[PDB]
Amino acid sequence: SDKNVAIIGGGPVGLTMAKLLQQNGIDVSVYERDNDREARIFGGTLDLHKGSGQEAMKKAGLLQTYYDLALPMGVNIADAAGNILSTKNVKPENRFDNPEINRNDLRAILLNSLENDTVIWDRKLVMLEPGKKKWTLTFENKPSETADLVILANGGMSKVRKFVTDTEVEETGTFNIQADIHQPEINCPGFFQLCNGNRLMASHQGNLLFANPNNNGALHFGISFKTPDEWTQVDFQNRNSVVDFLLKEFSDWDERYKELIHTTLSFVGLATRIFPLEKPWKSKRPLPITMIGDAAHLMPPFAGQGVNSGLVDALILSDNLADGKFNSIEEAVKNYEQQMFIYGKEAQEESTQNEIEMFKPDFTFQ
Ligand SMILES: Cc1cc2nc3c(=O)[nH]c(=O)nc-3n(C[C@H](O)[C@H](O)[C@H](O)COP(=O)(O)OP(=O)(O)OC[C@H]3O[C@@H](n4cnc5c(N)ncnc54)[C@H](O)[C@@H]3O)c2cc1C
Numbered sequence: 120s121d122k123n124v125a126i127i128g129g130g131p132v133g134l135t136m137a138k139l140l141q142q143n144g145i146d147v148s149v150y151e152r153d154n155d156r157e158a159r160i161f162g163g164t165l166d167l168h169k170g171s172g173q174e175a176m177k178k179a180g181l182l183q184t185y186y187d188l189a190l191p192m193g194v195n196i197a198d199a200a201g202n203i204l205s206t207k208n209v210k211p212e213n214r215f216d217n218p219e220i221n222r223n224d225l226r227a228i229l230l231n232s233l234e235n236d237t238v239i240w241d242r243k244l245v246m247l248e249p250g251k252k253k254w255t256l257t258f259e260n261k262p263s264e265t266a267d268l269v270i271l272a273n274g275g276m277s278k279v280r281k282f283v284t285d286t287e288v289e290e291t292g293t294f295n296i297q298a299d300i301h302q303p304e305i306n307c308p309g310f311f312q313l314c315n316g317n318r319l320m321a322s323h324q325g326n327l328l329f330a331n332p333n334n335n336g337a338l339h340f341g342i343s344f345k346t347p348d349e350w351t352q353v354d355f356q357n358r359n360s361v362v363d364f365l366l367k368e369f370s371d372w373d374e375r376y377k378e379l380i381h382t383t384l385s386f387v388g389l390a391t392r393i394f395p396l397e398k399p400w401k402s403k404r405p406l407p408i409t410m411i412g413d414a415a416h417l418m419p420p421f422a423g424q425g426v427n428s429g430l431v432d433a434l435i436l437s438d439n440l441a442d443g444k445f446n447s448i449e450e451a452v453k454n455y456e457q458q459m460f461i462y463g464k465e466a467q468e469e470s471t472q473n474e475i476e477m478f479k480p481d482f483t484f485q
C-alpha cells in the first residue's frame with residue numbers, strides 16, 4: 120500500500136477499524152459527525168463477548184484497558200410486582216462476555232490508541248463521489264478530502280450506501296423507548312433498589328422493560344413493544360405526550376416502575392430496524408469501497424450482537440488489508456465481505472429470532 124483509507128464514522132466499530140489499520144502502518148483517517156471528542160454518546164452500555172468483540176481489543180492491545188473500565192454486572196429478572204430470579208457474577212467468569220462498558224469510555228480508550236489527528240471532528244459526510252483514482256468525500260460546510268479506499272462505518276442509518284448495495288433499512292415491527300435518569304437513587308429509589316446494582320429485565324403483556332442501574336452513575340432503561348397499528352402519533356418532543364402513552368400501557372405495573380416513567384425528563388423513541396444481509400452486494404464498483412459495523416448489518420438490539428459482530432468486522436477487514444495474502448484491494452474486501460455475510464446473517468437470524476420470541480403474548484426470560 121502507497122495509498123490511504125477514509126473511515127466514515129467514529130463509532131466503536133469505526134475507531135477500532137482505525138487502530139487495527141494504523142498499527143500496521145496503513146495511512147488512515149476517521150471522519151466523525153460529532154462536534155468534538157467530549158460529545159456525549161446516548162445509549163446503554165456495551166459488553167464485548169470473549170469470542171469476538173474481545174478479540175479485536177486483544178489485537179489492539181486494549182483488552183486490558185477495556186476490563187479496567189468495564190464493570191461485570193449481575194442480572195435480576197422481575198415480575199411487574201417484584202423479584203423473580205437473581206443472578207450474580209461468579210468470579211470464575213467476571214472477566215468474560217459480561218463487562219459492561221460506558222459508550223464514551225470505550226471511545227476514550229479508542230481515541231487514545233490512535234495517533235493524534237487521526238480523527239477529524241465535525242465532519243458530516245453528505246456525499247460520496249468517485250473520481251479517476253480517488254473517491255471525493257463531501258462534508259457539510261467543511262473542505263472535501265480524497266482517498267483510495269472508503270470504509271463506511273457510520274451507523275445503521277447510513278445515507279451513503281448506494282455504491283455498495285441497493286438494500287435499504289426496514290422496520291422490524293417493534294419499537295423502543297430509551298431514557299436516562301441521573302442520580303437514580305434519589306429520583307427513582309423504588310426502581311433503583313429493585314436493580315440492586317444489577318441489570319434488570321421484566322416482561323408483561325408484550326411490554327418489555329430493561330434497565331441498567333449503573334451506567335457511569337446514571338440509570339439507563341428501555342421499554343419495548345410491537346409497534347402500535349395506531350402508528351407515529353406520540354410526540355417525542357412533548358414529554359407529557361410520551362409519559363401519557365407509557366402510563367396507559369404500563370397501568371398494570373407496580374408503583375415503582377411508574378416512578379421511573381414519571382421521573383424521566385426526556386425520552387428517545389426509535390423503531391427497531393434491520394439492514395438485512397439479503398442480496399449479495401454490488402460486484403461492480405467504480406473504486407474500492409466497503410462497510411463495517413451497523414452500516415453493514417444493522418440488526419435488532421435484542422441479542423448483544425451489534426458492536427461485537429461489528430468489531431469482528433474490523434478484525435477481519437483489517438487483517439485482510441495488511442497481511443499481503445491478496446492480489447488487489449478489490450480481492451481483500453471481496454473476501455472480508457464473504458465471511459461477514461456468513462456470521463453476519465447468523466447474528467441477524469439470531470436477533471430477529473429473539474425479537475419474535477420476546478413479544479410473543481406469554482413470554483418470560485425464564
Ligand atoms: C437502543 C439500542 C441498544 C443497543 N444495544 C446493543 C448492545 O447491547 N450490544 C451490541 O453489541 N449492540 C447494541 N446495539 C447496536 C449497537 O449500538 C451498534 O452495533 C454499535 O454501537 C454500532 O457501531 P458502529 O460504530 O458500527 O455504529 P455507530 O456507533 O452508530 O457509529 C457510527 C459513527 O458514525 C457517525 N456518523 C453518522 N453519520 C455520519 C456521517 N454522515 N459522517 C461521519 N460520521 C457519521 C456517528 O455519529 C457515529 O459516531 C444497540 C442499539 C440500540 C439502538
Ligand SMILES: CN(C)[C@@H]1C(O)=C(C(N)=O)C(=O)[C@@]2(O)C(O)=C3C(=O)c4c(O)ccc(Cl)c4[C@@](C)(O)[C@H]3C[C@@H]12
Nearest residue numbers: 163164295329330331339340341342420421422423424
Ligand atoms: C435496547 N434494548 C433492546 C435492551 C435494553 O434496553 C438494555 C438496557 N441496558 O437497558 C439492554 O441491556 C440491551 O441493550 C442489551 O444490552 C441486551 C443484551 O446485551 C443481550 C444479549 O447480549 C444477549 C441476549 C439478550 Cl436477551 C440481551 C438483552 C435482552 O439483555 C438485550 C436487551 C437490550
